[PDB]
Design a protein around this ligand. Structure first.
Ligand SMILES: CC[C@@H](C)n1ncn(-c2ccc(N3CCN(c4ccc(OC[C@H]5CO[C@](Cn6cncn6)(c6ccc(Cl)cc6Cl)O5)cc4)CC3)cc2)c1=O
Ligand code: HEM
Length: 449
């Protein structure tokens, strides 16, 4: 029959109160009370939490007409645009749009991306000076505003960042998104909407400029190392032959930059903080860096590919502090799952955060210990033991890029600076859509040369 329910405090509002304090602890606590599968009413939504790695196969392998992403992420529509990604007309169109982004994240482009990271950090160290303190979360976000923009949109975007305040507009859009929007998509957000329109106009100009550049240098279209997401969007069609609209192109770019920015800056923050706060971990990270760099003075893709330990540090941060704490679908048909049938209309929930603390999987899960991965391989105990990037048909297409951007940034910063964190590593703050550390996050830095 139906899964057990978390008793409602009120009707309607149901369990929103305990949930919103800490959605992660909410799931953990109620797992203990009611088991692997339970349902809670939250601001009117029937939400069925799947809480053990063992049972996640049917979630991640279901087709979109059984478990819909579009029904649950559609709320993003005012940020991304009408008709884009989870507001696409069909599952099929969404997948095609996702592929246009993934198509600018090729190995050829990755080699160029490393140079971009070097370039932006070099600009940034001018601001920072020989020593000081800086907010880690801001520093990463500020770096990734410039790096992700150039990576995805091309270098032509940088003059907008430097001269037309594009970075501020991103913030206006992105602080205009409340996690509550998940429940009340219609929440007015007029500042967000003004900024989104401004970025829209700028990205329209970027497209128009690229068009005529594709006139004066069609060779660009033949060079895989110079082809970015703007170029792919300007030269592709859907499979059935239908052309893209510039409105669609703008929305896809914005969606891509969104995805491309937060989850990464938050991960780089938690990673750097944990690395510089643990002497043994920092020693190993630096030993690895010194061996890989050899006599070489800057980064390249091949070097980054060898940074196995640093990559484990990032994965360990993702186990502990995955920035998307909930993965969701709406059931369009009833769904079995253990003894239970989950009713049509329920929202199924999987939590990367819960998974990362599960004890069937990880020993002392509150400790940041990259060696649980490299040596004890604890993640491999279950097929879905670690799902920071999701899994199955909708698994994150930006992974390897994430890994690249975060590893590069951390590696370059280490090369530049000795760094120590000020205070305890914070707790996560559940106030935002993408979850990051509670401010403030400060660190002391000093130049190494
Ligand atoms: C705020 C105070 C108090 C009232 N409160 N306290 C806590 N909460 C709360 C928190 C969180 C949540 N939620 C609901 C929203 N949520 C969430 C919803 C959708 C979602 O979508 C994942 C999809 C959609 O966007 C992306 C994100 N992404 C992928 N890679 C990097 N980011 C995505 C995929 C593709 C593209 Cl192109 C763009 C985007 Cl953004 O994947 C992620 C999280 C987290 C839990 C609800 C309430 C509160 O309301
Ligand atoms: C550490 C950084 C990142 C984390 C933790 C992360 C996490 C995720 C997760 C969990 C999903 C699955 C969502 C779901 O199935 O409901 C996902 C999907 C996706 N991610 Fe990421 N992501 C990261 C970086 C990126 C980057 C950098 C991009 C683009 C540049 C990106 C683009 C996407 C896209 C397009 C999807 C949708 C796949 C689909 O629906 O088919 N992500 N991501």
């Amino acid at each position: 029959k139906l899964p057990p329910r978390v008793p409602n405090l009120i009707p309607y509002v149901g369990s929103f109160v305990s949930f919103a304090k800490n959605p992660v602890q909410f799931i953990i606590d109620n797992s203990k009370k009611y088991g692997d599968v339970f349902t809670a009413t939250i601001l009117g939504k029937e939400m069925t939490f799947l809480n053990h790695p063992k049972i996640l196969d049917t979630f991640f392998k279901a087709t979109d007409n059984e478990l819909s992403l579009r029904d649950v992420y559609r709320f993003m529509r005012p940020v991304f645009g009408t008709g884009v990604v989870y507001d696409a007309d069909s599952t099929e169109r969404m997948m095609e749009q996702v592929k246009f982004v993934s198509s600018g994240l090729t190995t050829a482009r990755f080699r160029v991306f490393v140079d971009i990271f070097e370039d932006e950090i070099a600009h940034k160290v001018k601001e920072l000076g020989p020593e000081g303190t800086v907010d880690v979360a801001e520093l990463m976000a500020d770096l990734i505003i410039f790096t992700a923009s150039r990576c995805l949109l091309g270098d032509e975007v940088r003059q907008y960042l430097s001269e037309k305040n594009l970075g501020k507009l991103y913030h206006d859009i992105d602080d205009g998104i409340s996690p509550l929007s998940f429940f009340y998509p219609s929440l007015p957000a007029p500042k967000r909407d003004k900024a989104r329109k401004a970025v829209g106009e700028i990205f329209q100009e970027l497209l128009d400029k690229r068009r005529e550049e594709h006139k004066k240098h069609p060779e660009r279209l033949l060079d895989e190392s110079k082809m970015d997401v703007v170029d792919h969007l300007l030269t592709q069609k859907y499979k059935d032959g239908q052309e893209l609209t510039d409105v669609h192109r703008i929305g896809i770019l914005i969606a891509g930059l969104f995805a491309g920015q937060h989850t990464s800056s938050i991960t780089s923050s938690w990673t750097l903080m944990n690395v510089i706060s643990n002497k043994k971990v920092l020693e190993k990270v630096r030993k690895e860096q010194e061996e890989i760099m050899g006599s070489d003075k800057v980064l390249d893709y091949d070097k980054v590919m060898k940074m196995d330990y640093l990559e484990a540090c990032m994965k360990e941060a993702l186990r502990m502090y995955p920035p998307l704490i909930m993965i969701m679908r709406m059931a369009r048909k009833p769904r079995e799952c253990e003894q239970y049938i989950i009713p049509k209309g329920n929202i199924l929930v999987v939590s990367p955060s819960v998974a990362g603390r599960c004890t069937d999987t990880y020993t002392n899960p509150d400790v940041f210990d990259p060696e649980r991965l490299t040596e004890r391989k604890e993640h491999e105990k279950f097929k879905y033991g670690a799902v920071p990037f999701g899994a199955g048909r909708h698994k994150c297409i930006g992974e390897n890029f994430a890994l690249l951007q975060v590893k590069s940034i951390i590696s370059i910063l280490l090369r530049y600076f000795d760094m120590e964190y000020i205070g305890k590593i914070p707790d996560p703050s559940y106030t935002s859509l993408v979850v990051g550390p509670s401010p403030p996050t400060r660190m002391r830095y000093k130049l190494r040369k």
